[PDB]
Amino acid sequence: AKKMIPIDDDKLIMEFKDDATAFDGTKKARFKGKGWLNAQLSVIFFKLLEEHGIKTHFIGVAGGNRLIVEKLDMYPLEVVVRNVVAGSLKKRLPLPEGYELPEPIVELYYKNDELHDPMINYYHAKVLGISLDEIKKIEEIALKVNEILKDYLAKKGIILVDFKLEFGKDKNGDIVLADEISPDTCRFWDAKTKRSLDKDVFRFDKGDLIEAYKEIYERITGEKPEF
């Protein structure tokens, strides 16, 4: 759904594709316009976060589905922040889908396809070569990002249910937000109806993906999607 194209030692192109994949590629489909929507939503979110002084890999746009991003020494992590009980959290806590958490939960996953992205804790993270100090910074950033996105979206009648972030290290040694921020990598629910406006629509055939993703875009920008 994304292709990384190197430019040089300090930057690269992140290209967003219309291809969608779930359940280890056993489920595949192409959604005309998905790439554009995810790229554009990523821009909006990265820029919103940067306004608050969050460091992100975003540099500029290089076309509708193409972002220029700074090259990083990437942490082998998926960092997940959860506000509302959904998906895999139902397997860890005796709480129903939709349950509003008293505080946001941060989970750490070892980014590794062969092991199917297993959950880790701070000890495992050290073995993987990530210091406790780094993990503390990463979680602090993640929670700050969580609050900005959650509040921004809440004003637009969208629940930030949960989402995945990735991080890397820049030349200075600063920790920098990377990958993407889109309905591919977040759970968004309509505040009134609780319907999914994200990749779960595709994962579980709950409706029309392109329609859900256009909805998010329209609510954020006020504009019907261009392309």
Ligand X SMILES: Nc1nc2c(ncn2[C@@H]2O[C@H](COP(=O)(O)O)[C@@H](O)[C@H]2O)c(=O)[nH]1
187's contact among a second copy, ligand X, none, with CB below 5 to 8 A by partner kind, is ligand X
Token digits for 167?
A: 């991080």
CB under 8 Å to 170, separation ≥6 — which residues?
55, 70, 72, 73, 176
| Shortest distance, position 46 Cβ to a second copy, whole Å | 16
- Using CA atoms, how far apart are residues 193 and 195, in angstroms rounded to an integer? 5
Residue 179 binds which entry of ligand X, a second copy, none, CB below 5-8 Å type-dependent: none
Distance CA(97)–CA(141), nearest Å, equals 26
CA pair distance 75, 208, nearest whole angstrom:
34
Tell me the C-alpha distance between 227 and 219, whole Å: 16
**Minimum distance from residue 109 beta carbon to a second copy (Å):** 26
- Give the C-alpha separation, 176 to 70, whole Å: 9
- Decide whether 96 or 129 has the Cβ nearer to a second copy: 96
Which partner, a second copy, ligand X, none, binds residue 151 by CB below 5 to 8 Å per kind?
a second copy
Q: Where does this chain bind a second copy (CB under 8 A)? A: 52-53, 102, 147, 150-151, 154-155, 191
Whole-angstrom distance, CA of residue 9 vs CA of residue 16: 21
Q: Which does 184 bind (CB under 5 to 8 A by kind): ligand X, a second copy, none?
A: ligand X
Least Cβ distance, residue 102 to a second copy (angstroms): 5
Nearer Cβ to a second copy (150/164): 150
Q: Which is nearer to a second copy, 99 or 110 (CB)?
A: 99
Contact partner, 155, from a second copy, ligand X, none, Cβ < 5-8 Å per class? a second copy
Site for ligand X, rule CB under 6 A: 78, 80, 87-89, 117, 162-164, 184-187, 199
Number of neighbours of residue 224 by Cβ within 10 angstroms: 8
